[PDB]
Design a protein around this nucleic acid. Structure first.
Length: 107
RNA sequence: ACUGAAACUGUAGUAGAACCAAUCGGGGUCGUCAAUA
């Protein structure tokens, strides 16, 4: 399970692989550097669902996210989502502390 | 401006001599499987 911390979200575009570390930056060992947040954002899906019907693996999307903290690390908790062509709407605010997933209000 | 008649294509000969349906294999035994929070 340690090895997952040095995986990066990726795609292939035509015939090149692409990487999407996004706002996070790739640390030397491949881990997200300097305690910056996980490369991918986290979508609540089987509990505290962030609904638009629930999105699906092919969905191209636009979304708000919030920086959340847990223990040794932090991550972009998705807050609200729309299909890409649709309007995302207004900025959400200070989410619930979902237990040890603590809000920051950094959105 | 008088059909020739009569005559067994049969008589003797072992489709056989030689060759392995066989060569190798313990009815045996350990750590995997799924990916995140």
């Amino acid at each position: 399970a340690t090895m997952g911390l040095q995986m990066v979200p990726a795609r292939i575009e035509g015939d090149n692989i692409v990487l999407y570390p996004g706002t996070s930056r790739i640390g030397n060992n491949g881990r997200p550097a300097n305690n910056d947040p996980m490369y991918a954002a986290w979508l609540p899906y089987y509990q505290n669902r962030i609904a638009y019907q629930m999105a699906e693996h092919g969905d191209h999307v636009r979304f708000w996210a919030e920086r959340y903290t847990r223990g040794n690390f932090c991550y972009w908790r998705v807050r609200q989502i729309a299909r890409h062509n649709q309007n995302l709407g207004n900025r959400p605010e200070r989410g619930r502390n979902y237990g040890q997933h603590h809000s920051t209000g950094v959105i």
